Write a protein that binds this ligand. Structure first.
Ligand code: AKI
Length: 256
């Protein structure tokens, strides 16, 4: 499988990513619908992220899960690199958040389950997704959550980063559980738990784990978030304890 630009009809712009635009597109021979991300050779070098992208592509084509976004392949011409992507009709959870303001406990729990599964499968394959955020959470046709962008994976706004990562310290799979906590809080409250107007100060909040709950947040939710957002990685739940959780299970529509 080696592609080229003329293999595809280019469709509407889907939106800007910080390193490239995305377009709907359709492979001419099969009429297969998909997303195509146009990245520039020049911008990629300048930031020293060209090797980062190779890592991703490599990592991605090892991965297959109903709740992870497929990468079908890649290719370059002179000026640019192209990522051939599974297309996610229902857009970002980020957009659904702004549209809805905040999610109810049923949508929240379901997403956490879908994320945990997806995250749980990744861990078993020795892979960590360093920065998960609502921008990187797409929806499928049935409304399934799909994690995007492994380009940071291993082994800008700070809201979703755990202490160990911002304190310039050493990090393990326990990173992702912090991210679950931040996401879980944000879904229910409608904005992330450390959010500030400065970087320097979001830095403090995250570092001190300094957050409080609006009053409409049930004990069950507080219990899970409180357990996920722990300063010490090793104190954070197993991905399965999350999947077991009595507020997850009482609320969630999807299996585990
Ligand atoms: O970008 C990297 N890695 C990387 C890149 C450069 C340097 C280093 C690493 N990975 C990466 C990151 C993000 C993506 C997601 C690309 N959007 C998408 N990918 C697939 N289907 C999609 O469908 C949509 C869609 C948009 C609006 C309305 C309805 C549907 C999008 C979409 C595109 C831009 C913004 C918001 C959503 C979308 C894909 C890959």
């Amino acid at each position: 499988r080696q592609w080229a630009l003329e293999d595809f009809e280019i469709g509407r712009p889907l939106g800007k990513g910080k390193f490239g635009n995305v377009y709907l597109a359709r492979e001419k021979q099969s009429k297969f619908i998909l997303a195509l991300k146009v990245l520039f050779k020049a911008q990629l070098e300048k930031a020293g992220v060209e090797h980062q992208l190779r890592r991703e592509v490599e990592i991605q084509s090892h991965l297959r899960h109903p709740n992870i976004l497929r990468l079908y392949g890649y290719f370059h011409d002179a000026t640019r690199v192209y990522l051939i992507l599974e297309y996610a009709p229902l857009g970002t959870v980020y957009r659904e958040l702004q549209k809805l303001s905040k999610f109810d406990e049923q949508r929240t729990a379901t997403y956490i389950t879908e994320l945990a599964n997806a995250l749980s499968y990744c861990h078993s394959k020795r892979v960590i997704h360093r920065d998960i955020k609502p921008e990187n959470l797409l929806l499928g046709s049935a409304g399934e959550l799909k994690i995007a962008d492994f380009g940071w994976s291993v082994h800008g706004t700070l809201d979703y980063l755990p202490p160990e990562m911002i304190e310039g310290r050493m990090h393990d799979e326990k990173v992702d559980l912090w991210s679950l906590g931040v996401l879980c809080y944000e879904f229910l409250v409608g904005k992330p738990p450390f959010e500030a107007n400065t970087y320097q100060e979001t830095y403090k909040r995250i570092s001190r784990v300094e957050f409080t709950f609006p009053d409409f947040v049930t004990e069950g939710a507080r219990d899970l978030i409180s357990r996920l957002l722990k300063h010490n990685p090793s104190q954070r739940p197993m991905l399965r304890e999350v999947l077991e959780h009595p507020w997850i299970t009482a609320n969630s529509s999807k299996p585990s």
